[PDB]
Design a protein around this ligand. Sequence first.
Ligand SMILES: CC(C)CCC[C@@H](C)[C@H]1CC[C@H]2[C@@H]3CC=C4C[C@@H](OC(=O)CCC(=O)O)CC[C@]4(C)[C@H]3CC[C@]12C
Length: 177
Amino acid sequence: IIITFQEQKNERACIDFAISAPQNRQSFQYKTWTFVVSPPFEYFIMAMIALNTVVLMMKFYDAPYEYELMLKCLNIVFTSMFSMECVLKIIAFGVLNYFRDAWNVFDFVTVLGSITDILVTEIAETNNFINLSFLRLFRAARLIKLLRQGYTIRILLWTFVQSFKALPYVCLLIAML
Ligand SMILES: CC(C)CCC[C@@H](C)[C@H]1CC[C@H]2[C@@H]3CC=C4C[C@@H](OC(=O)CCC(=O)O)CC[C@]4(C)[C@H]3CC[C@]12C
């Protein structure tokens, strides 16, 4: 099936087709931009993603109940620091220049879900619904930030996934089966 697969030159077409194809310096906005674009800031936030996932990995059954408390407090600290980092970006870069990144919006959504999870955990029992707990996906989904750091795995995933987007009817045939 691999050896004999019909196409429905190439690289030359792709190159010749794709050949077609920052913030100013006014005020404290520039101070925030210089603070957030500093390579130390990016390395620090990457390390903080790493430590947040370490904290996620630290949960275990029948914890001493003070270990649970320090895990919760570490989650509080990480969520608040990610929120203030999101605020630093939303002020340094334009709100239009932030919400139109497709990665900054992911960070914003995960931060909002994280504070929402914190708020609900205190008063979860008053809701009494099945969806009381899906808000814990956001802390685990902050692990996706390291996917960007892993460059070649990101490229491989992107190529294969967008290939899947180019095949919406083979999956439909499988679903019909
Ligand atoms: C790349 C690595 C070096 C970074 C990530 C390491 C930690 C985030 C992980 C790795 C091993 C994990 C540990 C693996 C096994 C255990 C034992 C486990 O003990 C029990 O389950 C005891 C049961 C009981 O006494 O009731 C407690 C969690 C802990 C320390 C885990 C906590 C989180 C650890 C340290």
